[PDB]
């Protein structure tokens, strides 16, 4: 519901959701996303 949305706001108002109390399987991160830039800085995407 952060990736199935329809009105990702403009950058001047960067919508900020909070994700807590959950199991983060980033395979659903990959599925809604024909990626062009997955640049991770603090962590490696493979070990997420």
């Amino acid at each position: 519901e952060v990736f199935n949305a329809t009105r990702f706001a403009s950058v001047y108002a960067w919508n900020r959701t909070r994700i807590s109390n959950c199991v983060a399987d980033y395979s659903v991160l990959y599925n809604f996303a024909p990626f062009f830039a997955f640049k991770c800085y603090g962590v490696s995407p493979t070990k997420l």
Binding site: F36, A37, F38
Partner: protein, 49 residues
């Protein structure tokens, strides 16, 4: 012109304009991840014309 190399590999492939900037040691993208990944401790040159 003042160096001696044990062996030299010439990998050749035609790619799109942004993908030229893509090809480098330690990069990301659809090409640098699934098509051609230059190793991090690369010792060589890239040529794009």
């Amino acid at each position: 012109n003042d160096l001696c190399f044990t062996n030299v590999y010439a990998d050749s492939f035609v790619i799109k304009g942004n993908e030229v900037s893509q090809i480098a040691p330690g990069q990301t993208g659809n090409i640098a991840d699934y098509n051609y990944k230059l190793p991090d401790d690369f010792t060589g040159c890239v040529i794009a014309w």
